Design a protein around this ligand. Sequence first.
Ligand SMILES: Nc1ncc2cc(-c3ccccc3)c(N3CC=CC3)nc2n1
Ligand SMILES: [Cl-]
Length: 446
Amino acid sequence: MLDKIVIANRGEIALRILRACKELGIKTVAVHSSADRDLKHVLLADETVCIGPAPSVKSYLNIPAIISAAEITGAVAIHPGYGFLSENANFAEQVERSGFIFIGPKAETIRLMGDKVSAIAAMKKAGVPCVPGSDGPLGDDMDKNRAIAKRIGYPVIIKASGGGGGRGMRVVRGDAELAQSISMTRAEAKAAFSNDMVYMEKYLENPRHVEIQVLADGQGNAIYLAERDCSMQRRHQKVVEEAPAPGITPELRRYIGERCAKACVDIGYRGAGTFEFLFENGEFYFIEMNTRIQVEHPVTEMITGVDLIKEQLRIAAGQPLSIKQEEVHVRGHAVECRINAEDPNTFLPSPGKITRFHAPGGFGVRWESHIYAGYTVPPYYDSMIGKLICYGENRDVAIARMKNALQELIIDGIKTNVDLQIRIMNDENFQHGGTNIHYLEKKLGL
Ligand SMILES: Nc1ncc2cc(-c3ccccc3)c(N3CC=CC3)nc2n1
Ligand SMILES: [Cl-]
C-alpha cells in the first residue's frame, strides 16, 4: 500500500480522497492555494504545503509546484481528483517521469481519450457503438463535407477533436450553414485548444445522458459498475445524477457494460474510468471517455457497495480489483443533487461567507462537502460547494429521502440552488423518470 500521497485538488473531492486515504492508512499531503488554508481537508491532512496564490494557474494547475511538494514531503503518488490537471496527459507524464505514481491511467491512454477522433476510432474498433459520423477529421474540401453530411443525414453536429464540455460545437440542419459552421468551430478550436481538428456526427435531437463506470487494474481485470443518468443538466453542467438509469434493463446494462470492459482490455486501460453515451430509442452511442474519477461517482458507490476512490488507490499500489464482475450487483437506487453557491436568477457563482450551516442526516443520506459554519466560499474556483446523495431500496424512496434531506440542509449567508433542487425533486416528469438532456432548460424557460 502507498505510504503517502499528494491530493492535487480542493474542496469536496479533496476531502473525499482524504477520507479514502485515512481508511487505508495512507499519509496525506494537502497542497493548497493561499485562499484555501482553511479548507476542511487541509485542516485534517497529515502535511500541508501552500503551492501558490489564489488563481489556479499559479496553484492547482502549477505543475512544478505540485511536483515539488510531492518531492519535499516524500510522497510517492499524486491523486489529481477531477477537473484541474486530471485529464492533463503532459502532467501525468511529468509525474511518472519525476518518479511518482499518477493515480489514473497511463499518459498515453489519457492522450488517446483526450483526442475525440482517435478515441472514437478506438472504441468503434473495440466494438463500442458510436454516433454515425465522419470517422475521421473534416478537411477544407466542402464538396467532401457536404457529401459526408448527406451520407450521415441532417441534422449533423460539428465538433472539436481536442475539446470538451460542449465548448465550440454547432448543429447544422442544412447545406447552407455547413461551410460557416465548420469554419467557426474550427476557428474556436484553434483558439481554445491550439488544435483546429474537427469531426462530424449525426445530431441526436432528444437523447439521455447515460454513462458507464469502469475499473481496471494492472492484472488484466476490467469490470463495469452499471450506469449513471446525468440528463438533468443546464448549459453542459450536470445538476442531478442518478444510478441506475430508469428504463435500463439488466439485459441492456449487460450488453453495454461488457462492451465497455472489453474496450478497457483492448486499450490497456488502468484505474477508474467513465464511458459517456447518448441514449436514444433504446440505443447507446459513445461520445467520449473520461479517464478520471468524476463528480457523480457516489451514486455508483451506493448501488454497488464499491468504494471507487479506494479502488483507485489499490490499483495504483499494484493491488488487484477487490471485487469480480459476477460479484457486482445493482442494488437499490441513488440520487445526487449538486449544491452550488450560485445566484438563482443569473446562475453565476455567488461566493461569500457561510454564517449558519446544518447538514442533513438519516438512513440512506450521504453528504459530501467541505463546507462548515464560518467558511468563506472563495470566488476563484467552481461554484459547487457540496453533494447530497440519497439512497433507497427503490427510486421513489431515494427521491423521498432527497426531498427530506434538502429541507434539513441549511446554508445561510450565501445564495444556493437548494430551492431549485427541491423544485426538480417535486417535478412530475422527473418523478416519472427518463427525461432527456433538454428537460431542465425547457422547465426553467417556462
Ligand atoms: N451527435 C450528438 N448529438 C447530440 C449531442 C448532445 C450532447 C449534449 C448536449 C447537452 C447536454 C448533454 C449532452 C453532446 N455533448 C456535449 C458535451 C459533449 C457531448 N453531444 C452530442 N452529440
Ligand atoms: Cl467530473
